[PDB]
Amino acid sequence: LFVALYDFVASGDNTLSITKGEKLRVLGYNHNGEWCEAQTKNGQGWVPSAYITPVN
């Protein structure tokens, strides 16, 4: 269970737009940990790992 720290606008290619304060569920990461595959109310896709953090 994670929260978004900053807005991120999808750059396509299975990335996912997220908004600061939104909750996400994390499925995993890419090979170097820089991208995170996440689920939000808006769908599923890749977001910057550094743009989210655990919450609770």
Partner: peptide, 10 residues
């Protein structure tokens, strides 16, 4: 995942 790096945190 994208083959390009993500944006740096602001």
């Amino acid at each position: 995942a994208p083959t390009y790096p993500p944006p740096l945190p602001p």
